[PDB]
Amino acid sequence: MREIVHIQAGQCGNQIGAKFWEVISDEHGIDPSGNYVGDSDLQLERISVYYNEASSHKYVPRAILVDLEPGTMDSVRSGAFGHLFRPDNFIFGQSGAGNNWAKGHYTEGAELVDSVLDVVRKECENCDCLQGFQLTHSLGGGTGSGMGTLLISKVREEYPDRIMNTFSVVPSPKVSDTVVEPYNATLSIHQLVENTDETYCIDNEALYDICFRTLKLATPTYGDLNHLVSATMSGVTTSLRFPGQLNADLRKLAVNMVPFPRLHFFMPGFAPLTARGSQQYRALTVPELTQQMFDAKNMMAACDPRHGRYLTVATVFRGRMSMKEVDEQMLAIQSKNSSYFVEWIPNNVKVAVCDIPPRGLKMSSTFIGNSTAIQELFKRISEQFTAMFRRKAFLHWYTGEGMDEMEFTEAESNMNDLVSEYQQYQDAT
Amino acid sequence: MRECISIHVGQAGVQIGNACWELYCLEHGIQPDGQMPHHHDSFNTFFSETGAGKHVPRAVFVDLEPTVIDEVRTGTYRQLFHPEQLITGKEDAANNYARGHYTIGKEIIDLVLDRIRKLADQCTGLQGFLVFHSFGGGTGSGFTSLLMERLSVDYGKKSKLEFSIYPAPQVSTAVVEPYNSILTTHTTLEHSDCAFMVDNEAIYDICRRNLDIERPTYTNLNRLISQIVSSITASLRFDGALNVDLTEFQTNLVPYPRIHFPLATYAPVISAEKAYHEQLSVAEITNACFEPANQMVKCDPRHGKYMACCLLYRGDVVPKDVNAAIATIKTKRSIQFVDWCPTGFKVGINYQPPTVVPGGDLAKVQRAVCMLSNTTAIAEAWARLDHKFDLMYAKRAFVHWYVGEGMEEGEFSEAREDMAALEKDYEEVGVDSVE
Amino acid sequence: LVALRPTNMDRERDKFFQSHYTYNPQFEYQEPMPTAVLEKYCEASGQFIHQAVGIIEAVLEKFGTYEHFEAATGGQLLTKCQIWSIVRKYMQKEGCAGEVVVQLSEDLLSQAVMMVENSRPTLAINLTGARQYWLEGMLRHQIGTHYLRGVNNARQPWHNAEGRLRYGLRPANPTEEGLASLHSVLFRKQPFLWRAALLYYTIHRAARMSFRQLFQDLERYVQDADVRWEYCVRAKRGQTDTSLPGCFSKDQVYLDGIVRILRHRQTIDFPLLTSLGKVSYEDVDHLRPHGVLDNTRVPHFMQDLARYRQQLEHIMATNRLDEAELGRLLPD
Ligand SMILES: Nc1nc2c(ncn2[C@@H]2O[C@H](COP(=O)(O)OP(=O)(O)OP(=O)(O)O)[C@@H](O)[C@H]2O)c(=O)[nH]1
Ligand SMILES: Nc1nc2c(ncn2[C@@H]2O[C@H](COP(=O)(O)OP(=O)(O)O)[C@@H](O)[C@H]2O)c(=O)[nH]1
């Protein structure tokens, strides 16, 4: 019950999804062929939430892989853990978004969004009681941004009651992997703050920093970053895919973390993060995890929390632990950082506890902080957008697909309004 | 299923294509006769396949003088190309634009377009065009202008990439280079999505200094430009951790409709003996790419600003190092982008290393990087050409050939006005914004 | 000027000309009209009307007509190529090469306008009527004065509206356009302030006259119908029904500024005045203690300051604005 549908847009979304399904299959003991070879019945007691039991006793992920260029699709298809996706799912076009948002939302996307929605509808009717949607996409790449926003708008039209999750890879502050990414970011954020329940902001910069310093890895390949994001997502969903002394669901997180309709952008975090050698020289206790999760050097979003306040915080543990210990740790961490939390939300730590470790470890933890610091991010992007709009640079590519300036004017105004709201609530009293 | 055809105009284009297709046939393990004894499909994007194990290129070699095409037909790469494509004229434009655009080329443009249409309709996911053409030669300039206008009329919205041979400031083999250059630029300015400036003088310099060969033939320059092209297309033709298609190129490197003249650069370029004595850091090769002595156009980047850059890496590359190196590059002051473009990079990574052609000059490397950079320094270069034109027009020199071959003086005046307008636009963009 | 350039100027010009100058233009504008600015400049002054006419008559006495004055003193009409060449030489001379975008247009009501397009400085030059010895002056006006003052001003505490209030600044005009107008005619052999004087005059009459009447009135000073049409529109910017009296008095600023600056030239520090930014000549002593002058730019033509002052004397002499007359005009 409470089945979840997985959508993967853009190249980053698809790669993250490949690693994500690898992780999930490892969790439930699923062979690459798609048949169960596990050992613990609890794996199958909720196997339906992400998988569908196809006949002859096989399992197929409830995935809907979307793209506009067959390259990465074929890469996924050929590689291992690709032979179990249901082959009818791989929707792809030929033109390619060309790293443009106008193509990804108006011209090219309008031709595949119908087929995507049809497969979505088939999967929805297949499920018993739909729980919600999780969309894995970028914010820079044209396909990800444009087509994901279009799909979100259409789905919200057809399912205004379900819950919506997005794992959007926000552009990094220092580097810029693309050139027009401010435009894509602004338009995508406009659509998201329109029609999304929660948005898990991530930067590649923070993941680089974590893989470098904390994990002591000088050679971070994209496999590792995607592995980290996959572990975060698995930690988010294990609260319902598994039994727990204090269980959680996606709707619980949405209610707890989203005080106002618009302010629903979360920065995630994971713990423990230990190098290969520096593991046996540290104790794995709940206080250690809790103290690890609260610092700028372990936030997957490149913005110091100290510059603002945590509006709300959710914390999902795993593995066997003692509830009193967790309560004591949360009390201490809420006490000593009193200036780091908003005054008018007393007891602002949502807690959930699962019963299964994420494999290999004794106990893990996932942090989901809805703070005001992220305003800086938007601030940054907004400014960049403004600059690249003041000269109307690159404007012709977007204008040529039917979009006009007033779109950009409205989107920038909307983002500035959002930043104003964040600022207002940060200094509320 | 992402096809892209190649069109080689003029002798320069044909020889560069000889080099490029030699390189490709070496890359995918393709014998000269189209047989083949991380790869995927890969070659499908450039090689079409017939029933047997024989693959043929999607190339259209067009020329007005049969000499070089005959050399191709007689070369070791005889069995490869589809014999219908090797279109040969009868009398070359003889370094005259009017002949190459009004009189002679007007009589085989239709056959060329017909072969283009056949090759296009045999494909399904056509990406765009690769025109390999010089700038000084009559056939190059005239025929390329005509062909670009025709294709833009036919294929409304598709990628159109050129590899021009920008006329050098001091070494000029022709005598009427300013005329052909100005005319072909005035024509192609409204149709070419993205050109690719390369010059022979800079490649001479690079071959002498870096590769330590003092006496290079055109074979060597052709091999270098072929390597650049292969690095451009490796994204389509191979599996990479961050791929990029030509539409991404035209979107990223072209801020305005007219300013679309990025210059090329490649690294590392080191001789076999100097292959050791350096570990070839990706940060090192990035610095090499940004070194003003390594660019393949005789223009000092320090006199202008990089409006955009696109670095395509291949081989054993790790993204964190690329991020660090680009951050360092952004830190330095001598590399000063425009204020209004705070994000001046597109990055692409491929898994396939560059392959060294046997009998070549370079050394087997594990990492390589091709930079396509759109800057403002190139503007000054136009001035030089403009200057030359003015002098050669102040006396009406050589005008009689063009006049008597289907053109008017008012056209020359209009092209001069257009070049002045382009220079004005470059200068206007180069300035900073207020408030 | 963009906002007050009538949206139907061409259709009304053809109407005017085709009626043999008897029709009264019924102008329309891009909504909304800048009501505040219209009201601010709704009344014309006559304080310097006799100086204006003095300058105009001085020209016509020496050159007979404006037509001959223009051609004799202005030099040849310039091609686009020649304009760019002169501009490029100027930018380098001023040390602001590569900072300003240059554009060429036919639809400017003046010789040139300095703008901020795409949040970046833009110099639009009117190719229609650009002349050799005059163009250099335009550059001294827009770049040498407006642009340099602007860049210097951006570095000051009074760089925006709030800053002006806080530091208690008088308006930039008429000091701004006064300085710019003097600088336009700086190194000329016959530096008559024709443009300033005729603009001042035309506005004065516009306040009393219909378009028809104003156009006819100007015939006494300039014959060319196209030139007269320009001056009339400039004087009646914002007027919808030009059959009624009324003016936009803004362009009186040029002569107003000239007279004031020349009157007080002996007590003005011209480098400092430029270094402090968009400030009145009267505010110099007030603002000197609070100005940041480390990396402020002074125009090239002000480096030889002794010569600069000689030029100002030459400009007065030429325009019949001797010391004694300025003394009586403004007994400050
Ligand atoms: N890089 C490179 N350039 C070449 C090579 N061969 C010729 N060129 C260029 O070709 C130019 C001469 O004009 P072309 O374009 O070849 O003239 P064409 O192709 O023979 O056509 P016509 O002008 O009609 O004769 C020279 O400026 C060279 O720069 C080559 O092998 N490599
Ligand atoms: N975390 C992560 N991000 C990626 C990965 N690959 C690409 N990205 C991001 O995705 C963005 C590119 O979007 P992409 O999907 O490739 O372009 P699109 O085809 O137009 O959607 C870039 O900003 C990258 O930062 C990956 O493996 N991991």
Ligand SMILES: [Mg+2]
């Ligand atoms: Mg030839």
Ligand SMILES: [Zn+2]
């Ligand atoms: Zn002025």
